[PDB]
Symmetry: C3
């Protein structure tokens, strides 16, 4: 499949993004439990108590049993509101997080994908370089069988041949481990991916750094949270201060209670005291409570809440310094990426001709084998460097998008285009 | 000492593994505090209170003093149990952790040990390459003193000589800092370690990836915790639900209370009210409590508990995707490791011969010094690469063991064998 | 500006160090809230309750309203003290942290600064090496226009020229991103910084490792906290044990309460019961409470507190093994740094001569272009390696100071001296 398909297969199964989802869901569901306390609280009670006096109470025993139905209602309790508010701001922050986590699934899938591609290039270029050092090998031998070149010419091309093999060895191990990477992110294994279409490839000067910086300054998901979080630090200052406000609660209830006495001092005296009482009651009331002074606590708290607010602020600064540095760097790099794709595109030609000469010359005694084998090594580097440069350019784009905090499923389509030629991921 | 000894000296002192032990110990000891609440709670109270009426109560004062001995016992409180259970599942997870931390002391000690070894190799091979570029140096000089070679031949071998020195310099600094590494992990310094016995060295094709994967899928300590932890998430769902259940506690007590009145309204009225009371009481009772409705709280909690359960699940998927990627990579690498040890074992020969030629040729004006100094550099790389490949093979074995979650003191013995020749760790 | 100025401009704005400050401030301000509970707790209450009997209580209703002014005072409550103490020890640890965070602003600013310097060197040395491969290029062309050199001589110098360009490209991108680094730490952009004065440069053998180790063993901020934190672990053991001690609190209050009855059974009976009661009361008292047995809880806790104390101990060991490894490494590195500055200072000469030969020879057909272009590449490496070695030496000094835990604004001045020549940070 291609980038845009491999992505979607992951967006519906990546355990990391889902875990992040479930974390946002809990965060919001919690807003309920937060408001919960502002609502009616109904409970049922019932007791049974056997008493037994033993001094002036001697000879007096009793069996009472009650069962009330109590209800509570907050009339004015600032902290109970504060809490609800804060749980909401928290869910909000958790959301900005989930979004950030969504962007990461993109950058990481795209990167993982172009690693399996660059992995393939390295292998192919290593097989081309091997096949070359082989022709050159086979040839120094013929030229040596007619005494037109020392034995060293054959011993040299053999040595550099064995060496390329040790590489082709690992270059193939990497294409493998690069697919295990993709597998883990997307959850799948791919027989083939759509390779970068080198003909239709074109770089594109990036927006001026200034425009980039200014949108990121208003969209970068990281900066956004430092903002939300600073707000939350302020909201908490208020919370601390509520410790000074008074509260008004309402209570209501209806209960029955049946008591029965027994014992010495019960048999006689009468006085209608020890008669079995069977009470019934209905109640409603208001409770006002106001802190007057609590050992300095409420202020020590309000101060702390403010220092923590300063901290939240310093972190906002950091977030911003970071969103800046990330933007300028991403700008610099994408440019240097385009600039490098050119230099190497070039070097791959100057090295191709030079190799063609050395080879041609070697065949008529004008060029040394060392010159050939070195021209060969030079070409197959410029070749990989160029291949590599292209992938970094593609990624650097995604980086700027992410630094702006606007990296999405679309940016992943714009790239799904420069892809085309279906190549195998298996090193057969 | 050797690997198997250096390990044991660390297993009894590594501050990280011990810190992890103490963490498992606390975790289990806590299971007590968790059950604690399900047992009898006995306390002693005693008060003294001076009252002083001031309205209809004016002229009525009192001095009362009490002292009860209370006891509480949970009869049916689901959450109290739930708690115990959860504290147990927690200790369990903490155990799986400790085990994981035990494996790491192995892998890290073995690795730290083979780094001091590979560090030694780099130093030796750098000293051999220096001693070579010296002979070749001393020689281009004699050949130059008989005008058989330009001055450049001596200036070239000198330059490349100074360069090897700049290396031998750092290669020796690394053998040092490589020993500081081992020191930190084992707590000791070693004058010498058992070096890899290159003659008896043999690679061993690893188990099919499929078998590997399947055992890891049932032993990998990481995958194990994702399982334990997912269970815990479920256990917590139940816990949330317990908020709906009612509870039944039993209370018992025996207390005395002596009150004495005094004042205006006390001098006369009598009525046997203001007579000094000296009460005695014994009580036992049951208390039933049942939530009827708590502002939606209990469900908002049960929902949250479930979302968190989803998260626990997604992480189990991550654990698994990881155990897979780790097994398959470890398999790939160990193979590539064996495959590489061969290629380099080979290249060390093809490069040995080619160097012997260049040298032989240079001595009879047939080969250039550049050709000699380059053949020299080529040999002493293939030599190190091979040396290095062997160590990685050894480690890659330990890795697969770790991915399976069965890496133990034995696997550290199997390797203690390919060791032998006691080499110094000091670069004299 | 120079290092010592760039530093001060950051020390008054670095959002990370400020955030750390605010964290230490809260930590100390909290010591109040910790002591808070040991002081008088004054509150105001007032209720209103309408009762309505409905069985034996039928026909009896009431309207009562109260309003007390309560005060509480801890007489002897160990845990309330313990808490204050612990909050103090915590602020203490938070302080050692802030200090550590202060050192880091130094090391990081110095490093960010010397990276912008080494970044400049790499660019300059790459421009010198480019200007060289250009002269040599232009020359092989003239030598080629007189059939005195094959076409390959011009094709070779061209290829290696394009290659240096691909580098000069990135070396300039790095000087940029190296300035973004400084910007983020200091908050500023610098047109120019004081470059290392290469003439007045001299290395200085570091104190013996033993003296270094012994001071660090008594000043290293990291080892210090492991100590503070181990103490705190002990303090928490005591805290656990306080769960066995009894507590003595004092209460005091003055409240009024006005009750008024009404209803069927109220109209008549009289008996002076249903008359409106208007009570007044003043109270003071002592409350003694002593745990007798709490399901094993208090011990399960004291045990845990001890296992955690073992952990705190193991970590102290880790801290120490680390302070050791850090000192020894810094010692080793600064030495190897001095030793390396020498080897490269040397190699820059042996490579300078050899290049001068090759060039001289090439001009009279005695030396090959490949020999020239390689002597050129060899020189402009030893040159950078030397430049680089110097910077590492400077840093390694700062590292040892830090390992001792005495790195300060002064050490940043001693270095501000080896600086001088104002160089631009812009790659014009
Ligand atoms: Cl207060
Ligand atoms: Cl509910
Ligand atoms: Cl106990
Ligand atoms: Na694979």
């Amino acid at each position: 499949e291609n980038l845009m398909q491999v992505y979607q297969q992951a967006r519906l199964s990546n355990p990391e993004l889902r875990k992040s989802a479930a974390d946002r869901d809990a965060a919001f569901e919690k807003i309920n439990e937060a408001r919960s306390p502002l609502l009616p609280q109904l409970g049922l009670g019932a007791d049974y108590t056997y008493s037994n006096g033993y001094r002036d109470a001697n000879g007096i025993n009793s069996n009472a049993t009650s069962a009330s139905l109590q209800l509570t209602q907050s009339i004015f309790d600032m902290s109970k509101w504060r809490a609800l508010t804060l749980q909401e701001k928290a869910a909000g922050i958790q959301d900005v997080t989930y979004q950030t986590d969504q962007q990461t699934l993109i950058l990481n899938t795209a990167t993982a994908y172009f690693n399996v591609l660059n992995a393939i290039d390295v292998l192919s270029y290593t097989q081309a370089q091997k096949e070359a050092i082989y022709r050159q090998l086979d040839q120094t031998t013929q030229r040596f069988n007619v005494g037109l070149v020392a034995i060293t010419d054959v011993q040299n091309a053999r040595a550099q041949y064995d060496t390329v093999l040790a590489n082709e060895l690992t270059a193939r191990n990497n294409l493998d481990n690069a697919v295990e990477q993709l597998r883990q992110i997307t959850g799948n294994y791919y027989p083939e991916l759509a390779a970068l279409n080198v003909e239709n490839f074109k770089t594109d000067k990036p927006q001026p750094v200034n425009a980039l910086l200014k949108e990121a300054e208003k969209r970068n998901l990281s900066l956004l949270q430092a903002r939300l979080s600073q707000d939350l630090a302020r909201e908490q200052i208020r919370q601390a201060q509520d410790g000074h406000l008074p509260t008004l609660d309402l209570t209501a209830s209806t209960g029955i209670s049946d008591t029965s006495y027994s014992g010495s001092k019960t048999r006689g005296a009468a006085g209608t005291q020890y008669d079995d009482s069977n009470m019934g009651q209905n109640k409603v009331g208001l409770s006002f409570s106001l802190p007057i002074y609590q050992g300095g606590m409420v202020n020590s708290q309000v101060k702390q809440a403010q220092y923590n607010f300063v901290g939240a602020s310093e972190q906002l600064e950091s977030a911003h310094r970071s969103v800046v540095q990330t933007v300028r760097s991403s700008f610099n790099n994408i440019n240097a990426s385009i600039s490098s794709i050119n230099a190497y595109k070039q070097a791959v030609v100057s090295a191709q001709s030079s190799l063609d000469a050395m080879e041609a010359g070697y065949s008529v005694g004008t060029s040394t084998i060392v010159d050939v084998l070195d021209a060969t090594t030079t070409l197959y580097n410029a070749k990989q460097e160029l291949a590599n440069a292209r992938y970094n350019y593609l990624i650097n784009q995604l980086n700027i998008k992410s630094a702006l905090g606007t990296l999405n499923e679309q940016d992943l389509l714009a790239l799904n285009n420069a892809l085309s030629k279906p190549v195998s991921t298996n090193p057969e």
